[PDB]
Swiss-Prot record:
Positions in coiled-coil regions: none
Key words of the record: Cytoplasm, DNA-binding, Repressor, Transcription, Transcription regulation, Virulence
Function, as annotated: Involved in the regulation of virulence genes. Acts as a repressor of the agr locus and consequently targets genes regulated by the agr system such as sspA, hla and hlb. Binds directly to the agr promoter region.
Listed name of the protein: HTH-type transcriptional regulator SarX
Matching NCBIfam families: Staph_reg_Sar
A Gene Ontology cellular-component term: cytoplasm
Family to which the UniProt record says this protein belongs: Belongs to the SarA family.
Induction remarks: Transcriptionally activated by MgrA. Expressed maximally during the stationary phase of growth.
Length: 110
């Protein structure tokens, strides 16, 4: 019980100090890998699924996605047709960063 708390606080501090990422960010990033490794996904559509899967609010998700993008761990492209349609996706660099990051998580914990 208290055991989870310690490892959790610990993981949170570690990732924050090293990556300037929160655990929300990690959870969102993990989810992007299940949705836009290959294809690009519409922002609105990912937001919907992320809310359901992560029980996170719309703005919290937006904050996370924007931070991942600013930190060069996630990518975006707009529609040339509709100025308001935005997609996210992971390029190869993003994927290699993803893998490095989650190997780091795995070893901290276990």
């Amino acid at each position: 019980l208290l055991g989870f708390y310690k490892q959790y606080k610990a993981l949170s501090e570690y990732i924050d100090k090293k990556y300037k990422l929160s655990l929300n960010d990690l959870a969102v990033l993990d989810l992007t890998m299940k949705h836009c490794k290959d294809e690009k996904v519409l922002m609105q559509s990912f937001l919907k699924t992320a809310m359901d899967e992560l029980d996170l609010s719309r703005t919290k998700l937006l904050v996370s996605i924007r931070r991942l993008i600013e930190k060069e761990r996630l990518s975006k492209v707009r529609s040339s047709k509709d100025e308001r349609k935005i997609y996210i996706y992971l390029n190869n660099d993003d994927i290699s960063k993803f893998n490095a990051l989650f190997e780091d998580v795995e070893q901290f914990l276990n």
